[PDB]
Amino acid sequence: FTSFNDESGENAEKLLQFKRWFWSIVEKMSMTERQDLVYFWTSSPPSITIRPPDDQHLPTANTCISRLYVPLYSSKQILKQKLLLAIK
């Protein structure tokens, strides 16, 4: 039920690819990682804004509205790394 807001400036094939990468990573998360993710995103134990690409910046959240911000990373590996690093 999560909606995406495209604020990335990037092309549709890149956006679609990134969306696939993201859900793939979330699918493979452990129960502890998923709990850490939901807490990070929502502050409880709907949407994602995809920002322009920046491989040195971590994902952040506006928890008041349950909005995760994630830069459109250049690889699946970088996405996984920075998402796991952000939520822990």
Method used to solve the structure: X-ray
Joined together, the tokens standing for residue 21 give: 């990468």
Strand partners, 67: 47, 62
Q: What is the resolution of this structure in A?
A: 2.0
- Marked catalytic residue, from 12, 31, 64, 65: 64
Contact criterion met (CB below 8 Å) for 25 and 83 = yes
Contact criterion met (CB below 8 Å) for 47 and 4 = yes
Per the annotation, the verdict on 77 as an active-site residue is no
Strands 67-71 and 60-62: antiparallel
Residue the block writes with tokens 């850490």: 36
The total number of structural domains in the chain stands at 1
Kindly report the CATH number assigned to the domain that includes residue 54.
Answer: 3.30.2410.10
Integer Cα distance of 42 and 53 in angstroms? 23
